[PDB]
Design a protein around this ligand. Structure first.
Ligand SMILES: *[C@@H]1O[C@H](CO[C@@H]2O[C@@H](C)[C@@H](O)[C@@H](O)[C@@H]2O)[C@@H](O)[C@H](O)[C@H]1NC(C)=O
Ligand SMILES: *[C@@H]1O[C@H](CO[C@@H]2O[C@@H](C)[C@@H](O)[C@@H](O)[C@@H]2O)[C@@H](O)[C@H](O)[C@H]1NC(C)=O
Ligand SMILES: *[C@@H]1O[C@H](CO)[C@@H](O)[C@H](O)[C@H]1NC(C)=O
Ligand SMILES: *[C@@H]1O[C@H](CO)[C@@H](O)[C@H](O)[C@H]1NC(C)=O
Ligand SMILES: *[C@@H]1O[C@H](CO)[C@@H](O)[C@H](O)[C@H]1NC(C)=O
Ligand SMILES: *[C@@H]1O[C@H](CO)[C@@H](O)[C@H](O)[C@H]1NC(C)=O
Ligand SMILES: *[C@@H]1O[C@H](CO)[C@@H](O)[C@H](O)[C@H]1NC(C)=O
Ligand SMILES: *[C@@H]1O[C@H](CO)[C@@H](O)[C@H](O)[C@H]1NC(C)=O
Ligand SMILES: *[C@@H]1O[C@H](CO)[C@@H](O)[C@H](O)[C@H]1NC(C)=O
Ligand SMILES: *[C@@H]1O[C@H](CO)[C@@H](O)[C@H](O)[C@H]1NC(C)=O
Ligand SMILES: *[C@@H]1O[C@H](CO)[C@@H](O)[C@H](O)[C@H]1NC(C)=O
Ligand SMILES: *[C@H]1O[C@H](CO)[C@@H](O)[C@H](O)[C@H]1NC(C)=O
Ligand SMILES: *[C@H]1O[C@H](CO)[C@@H](O)[C@H](O)[C@H]1NC(C)=O
Ligand SMILES: *[C@H]1O[C@H](CO)[C@@H](O)[C@H](O)[C@H]1NC(C)=O
Lengths: 214, 181, 305, 229
């Protein structure tokens, strides 16, 4: 029943600055704790094991300490390539019943940036398939947190939409999110206005983008 | 008494069963009291035997009263009588290692000869008998030859060595070129 | 308790029932002390393939602390001891007596080298079920201890001089059992499992495998201070209680140190039918019964009314 | 150091069995211990179990112990993971990983728990759905009501199965300002996603934009241009 827990669900740090990740355990694990780094679409990378020994090919800016039920992952000067998710792992028990933490996402912190909201009405070819997909795009913003509300004829929709967010841009450090509202040929052709109410930190007031069906 | 035949380079196993199904003390020797293999409690030992790094057993069967002596990568000199002294007994066994090889390379031409040479340890009169894919079969005391080699001979040859009323197989691959006009 | 008896008895340390008692007792003391993280014992019920029984259990780091054991007469029996200062199991004993319990025996599992055991009063003694049978173990009992310091560092220390004097004694006795004009040669183990090829034992709860080659490379009748033998602590070993395998946890202490007294040796001899005038000996062991047997050779249980 | 090559992706129905392999090469296979670690899309890593290649003994996670089996063939230096009674929640990428234990063959075994060598991973999708390519739909530019200098356009890849699908623009000539969002799973059990890009409104009517959608599973290769109209 050994469970590890990483405090910072997400750590927003400025490039060049330092970052500290914590990992506690529900029970003593001595020094059998290891750290992993994970880029999207890649296998995990071993950084530290034995709670403090750095694995081969792991820069010195990376370092780990602690013991018992509390550990820390310190990265001196965060480099561009240090952008990733980090997981701890305890392998003290025996029989082997090893476990991982829920991970900490270390994201590049920059200045607030409002999104560029665009609305896409369902293509003509799609309406032929018997389904209407309305797409709202929020382009290049920061921070990641954003709210999206669909309004059909001033009717707050819900349950018929699904959001998707890209990985943080490796150039501008921004994020983009695609919100898709789905409906059948019937529902769509039975309503007038279709809006997309967006709310961000950079945007003063909510930026709504709508189109009249037709 | 018992006779076992083995192929050169192959792996032969020599059994030796006790009366009860309990892991007891045993050891193998040759014709000259030379310690080959044996056990000390639950551990295995090896002797000054000229088959040391090629001799072994199967501890998995010790609990069943079976203490085999498996000799891998057979050699001609390994031919000799072996004794398994267990629970005050001597289950003797004679070993005869054989080897059959072609004097020439497989790549031969229609009309060329094929000489198979067999290796037998001193004091042994084995009877050789090989069969070609097409059915051509030859017999020999130590060496067998085929003056002319037909195209239909290309393929696997099955040989059989007869010694002490016993026998062992030998598969030799041959190739013959089928020219044109 | 002791009571001298005027009569001739018959002993046989190669059929001594007490050996098996100890053997099973020790195997038990061990099982409850040195617990593996996993054990693998064979199991081919002949049902085709060989199934293997596997056990994964706690692995608490602890050291086997040999506590002296006294064996008294079992219900309905009595214990006789051959008071003779130099007796070799098989044979008659004129000087015998009934004892209450044996002398404190210090159980020790090891190979090719008996440690912390009883010494021989008079001279060095060698015993066997049949010296003529090269496949039989030769038990050597010394009349003088020989220290041997070992560390978790990776080696065992032994006086080059003392050991050189002990070999002379052994060889002197060997040529006495075999041939006078014969030569005594000491070579290394011929081969086999690790535990048998090296001087294996458990120090500080860890299993040691020390290369004894240096100790057995000499010929007799035909600066210099300490001898250093390479050891190695293993985690995966071959069980001695029965055909099987075991894995223990790695060491936790960085300073494992042990000092024992070499008291006896298990030797084995090379065969050969009418070779020449010379005999070669090698370190033996494996069958822990020979260890118990080296201490119990003078006792015997007997039915009494 | 050993290299960990995993077997190709798996697509199975719930209730089915799966057997993924991992070919290790580069050193002594028996001197390493291997572990399997799964990860469901959008989630963390989950330890499944580990085998001590030398002893040929394995230990599994509680919630898995019973319907999971790990083995290794010392002859081909391969490790196997077997999952029975497949469940939809089993969908995830399965990672094979190992670590040096010492000279196991000589009795030295550190019994290291951490993982130093990992594999590319094997995707294993468990669904009731059948294989099927997507139907690409156009996302015509926003040069309708919005007034600026940079328009937005892309493609809607909907109702396909299973993952993954690759998207791009102009045969790969265009990559700047392109965002290909991750795929979402719709109620229908089919995947979907959008690929967009913000180009200069002036470039419209002149520079033609075409998204290339590839879906190996269904052997579907689509090309759709996006006109302003
Ligand atoms: C081994 O050490 C012997 C003396 O050590 C004794 O035991 C240790 C545990 C300490 O308590 C120490 O005070 C004792 O004196 C030596 O007599 C012997 O020569 C050493 N081994 C060698 C190299 O022969
Ligand atoms: C004794 O030595 C020879 C026989 O013993 C063998 O010696 C060598 C060949 C070892 O490899 C092993 O096979 C035996 O221990 C005899 O040929 C020789 O005449 C004898 N006398 C001598 C010269 O030592
Ligand atoms: C292993 O072998 C034993 C005895 O032959 C047999 O009862 C068992 O079913 C086999 N498999 C298991 C459960 O280990
Ligand atoms: C020792 O064994 C020998 C060999 O049979 C025997 O003659 C003798 O009586 C035994 N006792 C002695 C003298 O140690
Ligand atoms: C036994 O030790 C004594 C001295 O304690 C010595 O004189 C004797 O030679 C040793 N035994 C033999 C004969 O090897
Ligand atoms: C005694 O040794 C000989 C030679 O090996 C052999 O008969 C057997 O090992 C033993 N026999 C007896 C009667 O003890
Ligand atoms: C033992 O003494 C020395 C060791 O210091 C050694 O060189 C020699 O070989 C031995 N001498 C004898 C035969 O006792
Ligand atoms: C040590 O023992 C090994 C085998 O265990 C052997 O190959 C080597 O020659 C020995 N060397 C020494 C230290 O005597
Ligand atoms: C011979 O014995 C010496 C010690 O006297 C030892 O150092 C050497 O290793 C032995 N011979 C070899 C090389 O095996
Ligand atoms: C027994 O060995 C110890 C070292 O552990 C040593 O101190 C002691 O002197 C030895 N006793 C004997 C038998 O002389
Ligand atoms: C007896 O030998 C053991 C080795 O098994 C050692 O640990 C212990 O210190 C010795 N006892 C004495 C009397 O020093
Ligand atoms: C033992 O010897 C004594 C000598 O005093 C004798 O009286 C006695 O009868 C002997 N024991 C036997 C064999 O009866
Ligand atoms: C034991 O040896 C003594 C002499 O040391 C001898 O008198 C006796 O016969 C032998 N065995 C016994 C106890 O009879
Ligand atoms: C046994 O009897 C003999 C002969 O009387 C005597 O020399 C010896 O001291 C006795 N042994 C013991 C210690 O009981």
């Amino acid at each position: 029943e050994l469970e590890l827990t990483q405090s910072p669900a997400t750590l927003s740090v400025s490039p060049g600055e330092r970052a500290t990740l914590s990992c506690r355990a529900s029970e003593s694990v001595s020094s059998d704790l290891a750290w992993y780094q994970q880029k999207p679409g890649q296998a995990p990378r071993l950084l530290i094991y034995g709670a403090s020994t750095r694995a081969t090919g792991v820069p010195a800016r990376f370092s780990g300490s602690g013991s018992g039920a509390e550990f820390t992952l310190t990265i001196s000067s965060l480099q561009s390539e240090d952008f990733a998710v980090y997981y701890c792992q305890q392998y003290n028990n025996w029989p082997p019943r090893y476990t991982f933490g829920q991970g900490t996402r270390l994201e590049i912190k920059r200045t607030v940036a409002a999104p560029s909201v665009f609305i896409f009405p369902p293509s003509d070819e799609q309406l032929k398939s018997g389904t209407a997909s309305v797409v709202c795009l929020l382009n290049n913003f920061y921070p990641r947190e954003a709210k999206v509300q669909w309004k059909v004829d001033n009717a707050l929709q819900s349950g018929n939409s699904q959001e998707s967010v890209t990985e943080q841009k490796s150039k501008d450090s921004t994020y983009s999110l695609s919100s898709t509202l789905t409906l059948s040929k019937a529902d769509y052709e039975k309503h007038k206005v279709y809006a997309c109410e967006v709310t961000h930190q950079g945007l003063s007031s909510p930026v709504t983008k709508s189109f009249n069906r037709g | 008494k018992k006779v076992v035949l083995g192929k050169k380079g192959d792996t032969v196993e020599l059994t030796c069963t006790a009366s009860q199904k309990k892991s007891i003390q045993f050891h193998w020797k040759n014709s000259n009291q030379i310690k080959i293999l044996g056990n000390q409690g639950s551990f295995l030992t090896k002797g000054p035997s000229k088959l040391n790094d090629r001799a072994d057993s199967r501890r998995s069967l010790w609990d069943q009263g079976n203490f085999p002596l498996i000799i891998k990568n057979l050699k001609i000199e390994d031919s000799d009588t072996y004794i398994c002294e267990v629970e005050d007994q001597k289950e003797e066994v004679q070993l005869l290692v054989f080897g059959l090889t072609a004097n020439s390379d497989t790549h031969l031409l229609q009309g060329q000869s094929l000489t198979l040479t067999l290796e037998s340890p001193p004091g042994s009169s084995p009877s050789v008998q090989c069969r070609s894919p097409r059915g051509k079969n030859i017999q020999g005391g130590k060496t067998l030859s085929v003056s002319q080699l037909e195209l239909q001979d290309s393929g696997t040859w099955t040989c059989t060595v007869l010694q002490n009323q016993k026998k062992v197989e030998f598969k030799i691959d041959i190739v013959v070129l089928a020219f044109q006009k | 308790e002791v009571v001298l008896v005027n009569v001739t008895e018959n002993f046989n340390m190669w059929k001594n029932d007490m050996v098996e008692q100890m053997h099973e007792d020790i195997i038990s003391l061990w099982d409850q002390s040195l617990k593996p993280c996993v054990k693998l014992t064979p199991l081919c019920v002949g049902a085709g393939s060989c199934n293997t029984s596997v056990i994964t259990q706690a692995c608490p780091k602890v050291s086997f602390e040999p506590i002296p054991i006294h064996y008294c007469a079992p219900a309905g029996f009595a214990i006789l001891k051959c008071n003779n200062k130099t007796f070799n199991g098989t044979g008659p004993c004129t000087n015998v007596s009934t004892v209450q319990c044996t002398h404190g025996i210090r159980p020790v599992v090891s190979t090719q080298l008996l440690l912390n055991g009883s010494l021989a009063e008079e001279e060095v003694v060698i015993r066997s079920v049949n010296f003529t049978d090269n496949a039989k173990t030769i038990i050597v009992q010394l009349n003088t201890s020989v220290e041997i310091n070992c560390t978790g560092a990776g080696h065992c220390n032994i006086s080059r001089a003392k050991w050189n004097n002990t070999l002379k004694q052994i060889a002197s006795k060997l040529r006495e059992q075999f041939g006078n004009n014969k030569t005594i040669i000491f070579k290394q183990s011929s081969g086999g499992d690790p535990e048998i090829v090296t001087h294996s034992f458990n120090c500080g709860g860890e299993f040691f495998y020390c290369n004894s080659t240096q100790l057995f490379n000499s010929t007799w009748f035909n600066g210099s201070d300490t001898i250093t033998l390479p050891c190695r602590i293993k985690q995966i070993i071959n069980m001695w209680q029965k055909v099987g395998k075991a894995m223990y946890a790695p060491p936790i202490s960085g300073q494992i140190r042990c000092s024992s007294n070499i008291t006896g040796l298990l030797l084995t001899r090379d065969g050969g039918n009418s070779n020449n005038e010379s005999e070669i000996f090698r370190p033996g062991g494996g069958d822990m019964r020979d260890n118990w047997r080296s201490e119990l050779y003078k006792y015997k249980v007997v039915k009494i009314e | 150091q050993v290299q960990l090559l995993e077997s190709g992706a798996e697509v199975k129905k719930p209730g089915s069995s799966v057997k993924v392999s991992c070919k290790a090469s580069g050193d002594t296979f028996i001197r390493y211990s291997f572990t399997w670690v799964r990860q469901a899309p959008g989630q963390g890593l989950e330890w499944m179990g580990r085998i001590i290649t030398i002893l040929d003994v394995a230990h599994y996670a509680p919630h898995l112990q019973g319907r999971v089996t790990i083995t290794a063939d010392k002859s081909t230096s391969t490790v196997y993971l077997e999952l029975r009674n497949l469940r939809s929640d089993d969908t995830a990428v399965y990672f094979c990983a190992g670590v040096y234990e010492g000279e196991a063959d000589e009795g030295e075994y550190r019994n290291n728990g951490f993982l130093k060598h990992w594999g590319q991973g094997t995707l294993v999708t468990v669904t009731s759905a059948s294989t099927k390519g997507p139907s690409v739909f156009p996302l015509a530019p926003s040069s309708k009501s919005t007034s600026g200098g940079t328009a937005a356009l892309g493609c809607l890849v909907k109702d396909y199965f299973p993952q993954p699908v690759t998207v791009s623009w102009n045969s790969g000539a265009l990559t700047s300002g392109v965002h290909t969002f991750p795929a979402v799973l719709q109620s229908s059990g089919l995947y979907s996603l959008s690929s967009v890009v913000t180009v200069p409104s002036s470039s419209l009517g002149t520079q033609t934009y075409i998204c290339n959608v590839n879906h190996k599973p269904s052997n579907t290769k689509v090309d759709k241009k996006v006109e302003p109209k």
